[PDB]
């Protein structure tokens, strides 16, 4: 599809069109501070092309927004290479939000979820988070309408044992939470429940095929999901492989190479040799 930069969208909705053809946002996505927006500015708006965010997803004080089901219906993985505090998902003082509707979100690699102070918000206790996040211990979901024991939640779907009773699991009235059988794990499955290929992440358009993943689990290179970048390719942004040249181009006007990774900075104990971008250990103490 497209890989675009981590964005910061505020005030006017107009800036939001910068995302229209994007499939992966390399970095984070932050949409915030829109005080004059109304329901009807969203009833015609969608980003079905966005499948993955590499860092974190963050929504804060966006008014008139009632569900995300039409905003990001097909976001499937959030990778959490960088986190906002400890969070890979932040839903905060999202006044007007009724329901989440990320019915396609299968996995949040790394981070935790913080969903707080969202009066109006239900369909939260109807989600089994343990099917999306590794560590849910540090989940922080309080002070939503859902905490008032008074929610009209309605969904067919499966029930999990999170509490002292099984609980039907769904996102909206018309979308169940997808659960893959236990041993498929993080790889995803078809509607029947045949496991997708083991190097795929959340979903696949076809079973048993590493070019037909919906979001690579390890690294992406040249169409396929792979275990690792072979040389002469370098690990980038902890999700995709590139050659020396790509990495170099970025650096010149602040990327460097070390451990076969392309990274912003040389790690401690190392200085940057000028001819080759390669971090080398220091001759005596490091001035840095």
């Amino acid at each position: 599809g497209e890989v675009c930069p981590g964005m910061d969208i505020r005030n006017n909705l107009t800036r939001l069109h910068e995302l229209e053809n994007c499939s992966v946002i390399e970095g984070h996505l932050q949409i915030l501070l829109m005080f004059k927006t109304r329901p009807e500015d969203f009833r015609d708006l969608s980003f079905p092309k966005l499948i993955m965010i590499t860092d974190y997803l963050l929504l804060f004080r966006v008014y008139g927004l009632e569900s995300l089901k039409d905003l990001f219906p097909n976001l499937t993985v959030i990778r959490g290479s960088r986190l906002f505090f400890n969070y890979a998902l932040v839903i905060f003082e999202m006044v007007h939000l009724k329901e989440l509707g990320l019915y396609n979100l299968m996995n949040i690699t790394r981070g935790s979820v913080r969903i707080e102070k969202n009066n109006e918000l239900c369909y939260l206790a109807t989600i089994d988070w343990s099917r999306i996040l590794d560590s849910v211990e540090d989940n922080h979901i309080v002070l939503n309408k859902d905490d008032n024991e008074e929610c009209g939640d309605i969904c067919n779907c499966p029930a999990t044992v999170i509490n002292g009773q099984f609980v039907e699991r769904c996102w909206t009235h018309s979308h169940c939470q997808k659960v893959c059988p236990t041993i498929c794990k993080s790889h995803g499955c078809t509607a029947e429940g045949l496991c997708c290929h083991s190097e795929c992440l959340g979903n696949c358009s076809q079973p048993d095929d590493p070019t037909k993943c919906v979001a690579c689990r390890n690294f992406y290179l040249d169409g396929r999901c792979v275990e690792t970048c072979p040389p002469p390719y370098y690990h980038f942004q902890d999700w995709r492989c590139v050659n020396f040249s790509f990495c170099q181009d970025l650096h010149h006007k602040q990327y460097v190479i070390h451990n076969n990774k392309c990274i912003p900075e040389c790690p401690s104990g190392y200085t940057m040799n000028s001819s080759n971008l390669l971090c080398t250990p220091c001759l005596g103490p490091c001035p840095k």
């Epitope: 040249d222 169409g223 396929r224 072979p230």
Partner: antibody, heavy 116, light 113 residues
Amino acid sequence: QVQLKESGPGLVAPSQSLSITCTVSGFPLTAYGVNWVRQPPGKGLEWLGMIWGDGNTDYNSALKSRLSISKDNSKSQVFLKMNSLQTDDTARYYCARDPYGSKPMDYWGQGTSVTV
Amino acid sequence: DIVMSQSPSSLVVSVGEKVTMSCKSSQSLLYSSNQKNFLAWYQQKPGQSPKLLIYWASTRESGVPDRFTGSGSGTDFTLTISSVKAEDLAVYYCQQYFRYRTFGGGTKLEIKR
């Protein structure tokens, strides 16, 4: 349905060139690499070259410009082209798949006989 | 491209026993970024085209029985066949896939009767 089969001319007189077509099916050539390997009867297996998903090329330095590897991805074909052969080039020629990122050489052709 | 060397040129053994052949490279094959060695083992049952067996020098290919066991790290590698069954007879080769690809001279396995 991963399958490879090589098309050799079989018989080549010295000082003339070798053109082999590896025809693969079941996978996209835009997404995997392909290697060329030969074996003279009862001798070793010899790596000749590979062509990556992006058109990038690797040749054994043994082949001093003698080897050219190119492709037609829309028609699922890989072309090896090798100039001015001698009798020491009498061997069985294979292409084999290369899932570079994840695997090494999975799935081989049955191999085609080439004699100089 | 680097240089690979195997031993022996050929070996013989009878049914039931374990077998270990070796290989060596002119450069270290352990990939830093994931801690895996970029080496392969292939078996070629004779008359047929070879079959992939063991990659990252220890990862077993699906469809390979547990009796096949890969080892070694750095520049020096070994392949092990624990408990020989009848049609285990083949010539085995080592391949590096670190930079380009090159094969070893190979080593032949024969069976006693």
